[PDB]
A and B are shown apart, each in its own frame.
With several copies, the nearest count.
Chain A
Amino acid sequence: SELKTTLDAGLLHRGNLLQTIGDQFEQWNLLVKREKSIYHTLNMLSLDVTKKCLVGEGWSPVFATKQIQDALERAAFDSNSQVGAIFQVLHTKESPPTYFRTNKFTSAFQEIVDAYGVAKYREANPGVFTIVTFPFLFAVMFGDWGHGICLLLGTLVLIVREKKLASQKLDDITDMTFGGRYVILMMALFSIYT
């Protein structure tokens, strides 16, 4: 009985400690992710001891580079360093991969269309036309104004519950369906019109 009481007390103390240990590990997960990102940057990008700085080059959006580099330099200066980071541009004959900016609703359609590939930094983007073309064609194959209402209603609940849906996980097929709620709603509206 004494040994069981001691074991119970030790287990209770361990659980009480783990209650805060898990809370600390919650933020430690993001800390470890940031450390891993910095480690990948260090192992991938070299540095100059003569410059006593980490230097390199990489692709960046011109619009983003208009403010991101300045913000990084300002943060480096605010980090009590003797001098902030650089913001110089670089040029090369190679064509870096690039992605067009994705909106909150256009993201799903853009991802669906991009499953065939990508293009140059500012080349043709068939996603712009197909964002409405696919609803403009998939409606005909299912044109019946008694079921399109049902499809829209089913999509509508997903859009409404999006606040809770974004947090709670679901089935893999269910998650894939919820990923394109706006596209599903647009297709349902087109089908209702058809």
Chain B
Amino acid sequence: GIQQLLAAEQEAQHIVAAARNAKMARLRQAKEEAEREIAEHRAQVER
């Protein structure tokens, strides 16, 4: 009952924490990847 209901709440909280971390993870990963891509694009200008 109360313990059974608490498990769903704990799972929801864990999923919320994962989603919160996903923002920073995606931001940093995209920043690095697009830095590499922009470096390649700037190299293209040299060619």
- Using CB atoms, name the residue of chain B closest to A86: B1
**A interface, by DSSP: helix, strand, loop or mixed?**
loop
* Interface of chain A residues 75 through 99 with chain B (CB within 8 A): 88
Q: What 1/0 flags go to B1-19 for Cβ under 8 Å of A? A: 1000110110000000000
Q: Whole-angstrom distance from the CB of B6 to the nearest CB of chain A?
A: 6
A88: chain B residues at CB < 8 Å are 1
A51: chain B residues at CB < 8 Å are 5, 9
Q: Does A50 contact B (CB under 8 A)?
A: yes
**B interface, by DSSP: helix, strand, loop or mixed?**
helix
Total interface residues in chain A, CB < 8 Å: 4
Number of A-B contacts (CB under 8 A): 8
- Using CB atoms, name the residue of chain A closest to B7: A50
B5: chain A residues at CB < 8 Å are 48, 50-51
B1: chain A residues at CB < 8 Å are 88
A50: chain B residues at CB < 8 Å are 5-6, 8-9
Q: What 1/0 flags go to A32-64 for Cβ under 8 Å of B? A: 000000000000000010110000000000000
B8: chain A residues at CB < 8 Å are 50
A48: chain B residues at CB < 8 Å are 5
* Interface of chain B residues 1 through 47 with chain A (CB within 8 A): 1, 5-6, 8-9
Q: Whole-angstrom distance from the CB of A82 to the nearest CB of chain B?
A: 13
Which among B1, B5, B6 has the highest number of chain A CB atoms within 10 Å? B5
5 more contacts with CB within 8 A, not counting A50-B6, A51-B5, A88-B1, are A48-B5, A50-B5, A50-B8, A50-B9, A51-B9
Q: Interface of A with B (CB < 8 Å)?
A: 48, 50-51, 88
What would 8 A/B residue contacts be, using CB atoms closer than 8 Å?
A48-B5, A50-B5, A50-B6, A50-B8, A50-B9, A51-B5, A51-B9, A88-B1
